């Protein structure tokens, strides 16, 4: 449980705010604190017991909390920002801490620009290979975030499926890719196979089918 | 200033276990809560467990809830998690993290983990297929189930290799990494145009060429 939205995004000085919820079993009572984690250090402790802030930490990074919810504003953004974040707090029900979904917060340094899909069905070897590798190819997107699962058919299910992380390219854009695996036989029954590839509010499903 | 530094991890077949250590040097280790974090490759941090200053009460999450074990040994400022049956899930990057004095709930000084990789693999290839061609189509190889991380692609020997991008590769389940790479062209040189991957898995010693084609087929 414990959802902040995948994304964020502003411009090299604006505000921003990432939301975290989850439920009364925790945020509701327990406090709530956010952690800031650039790409492959360690995490640091930004924001605690709702609105606190370590000594070592500005004052443009404000923090509250509204009913079952808390909420990380940003004030002034800079490249310095531009890293992962994550809102924590404690479950009174399941006695164990809770983390968030995480959101990245990138801070607008080229044109936004959507997702470009490209999902290649089996190869025809492989199949004989008794195995199904489903190819999802997704590209050149400002913001390097997404949102990635797929549906066999009506239905969707994660039962098999790997999803690899944003990196960016020699265009300057990121870009990522998914798999779904499967038994050649699972291929034939269920006539139908999607992608989905969502991404600043606007998702797109791309789907291929047995023949 | 504080100094928190994880160790003791890498690779290990499923199930046997392995443990993990952390060491405080800059406070008084003897007198604050303890944490354990892990974050899997790409998803978020995950919670595992915390131990009291005196190592008596601690909680662990139904995550494991009985596969883990965190001791901990205040003579020697050192921070363990016992991790017995490793599930694959299980690979991550394992965090170690001081809670508040006052506040347990406050995670203030973490370091860089150590990286744990449950995967029963030794040294294999790679798997290469033909992702058939289709403003103007992309195509590209499919490289699947290796063990050995490193792996380099090009294509046709590096004949312009703008408009390709070879992807980061994947720690499946079978703990075997796999990985593509695509190529864009003008969807009007089909069958003109030659169009193949010239592979490379150093760890199983192999070099591969699949000559992809365009799928006159459905």
């Known amino acids: 449980v414990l959802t902040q939205p995948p994304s964020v995004s502003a411009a090299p000085g604006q505000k921003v705010t990432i939301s975290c919820s989850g439920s009364?079993?925790?945020?509701?009572?327990?406090?709530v604190s956010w952690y800031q984690q650039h790409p492959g250090k360690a995490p640091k402790l930004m924001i605690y017991?709702?609105?606190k802030r370590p000594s070592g930490v500005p004052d443009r990074f404000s923090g509250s909390k509204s009913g079952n919810s808390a909420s990380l504003d940003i004030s002034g953004l800079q490249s310095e920002d531009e890293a992962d974040y994550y809102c924590?707090?404690?479950?009174?029900?399941?006695?164990?801490?809770?983390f968030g979904t995480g959101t990245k917060l990138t801070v607008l340094g080229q044109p936004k620009a959507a997702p470009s899909v490209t999902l290649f069905p089996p190869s025809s070897e492989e199949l004989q290979a008794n195995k199904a590798t489903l190819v999802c190819l997704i590209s050149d997107f400002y913001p390097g975030a997404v949102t990635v699962a797929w549906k066999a058919d009506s239905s969707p299910v994660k039962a098999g499926v790997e999803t690899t992380t944003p990196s960016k390219q020699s265009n300057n854009k990121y870009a990522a890719s998914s798999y779904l695996s499967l038994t050649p036989e699972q291929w034939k029954s269920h006539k139908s196979y999607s992608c989905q590839v969502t991404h600043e509010g606007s998702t797109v499903e791309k789907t291929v089918a047995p023949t | 200033g504080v100094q928190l530094v994880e160790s003791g991890g890498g690779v290990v077949q499923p199930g046997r276990s392995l443990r993990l250590s952390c060491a405080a040097s800059?406070?008084?280790?003897?007198?604050?809560?303890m944490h354990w974090v892990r974050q899997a490759p790409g998803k978020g941090l995950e919670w595992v467990a915390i131990?009291?200053?005196?190592?008596?009460?601690?909680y662990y999450a139904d995550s494991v809830k009985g596969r883990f074990t965190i001791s901990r040994d205040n003579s020697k400022n050192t921070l363990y998690l016992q991790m017995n049956s490793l599930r694959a899930e299980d690979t991550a990057v394992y965090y170690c993290?001081?809670?508040?004095?006052?506040?347990?709930?406050?995670?203030?000084?973490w370091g860089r983990g150590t990286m744990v990789t449950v995967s029963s693999a030794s040294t294999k290839g790679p798997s290469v297929f033909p992702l058939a061609p289709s403003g103007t189509a992309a195509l590209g190889c499919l490289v699947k189930d290796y063990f050995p991380e490193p792996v380099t692609v090009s294509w046709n020997s590096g004949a312009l290799t703008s408009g390709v991008h070879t992807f980061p590769a994947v720690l499946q389940s079978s703990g075997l990494y796999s990985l593509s790479s695509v190529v864009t062209v003008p969807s009007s040189s089909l069958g003109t145009q030659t169009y193949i991957c010239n592979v490379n898995h150093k760890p199983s010693n192999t070099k591969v060429d699949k000559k992809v084609e365009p799928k006159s087929c459905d």
């Open positions: 993290a001081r809670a508040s004095i006052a506040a347990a709930r406050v995670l203030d000084y």
């Open positions: 800059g406070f008084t280790f003897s007198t604050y809560a």
């Open positions: 131990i009291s200053y005196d190592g008596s009460k601690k």
């Open positions: 009364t079993s925790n945020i509701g009572n327990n406090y």
């Open positions: 017991d709702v609105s």
């Open positions: 924590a707090a404690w479950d009174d029900s399941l006695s164990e801490f809770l």
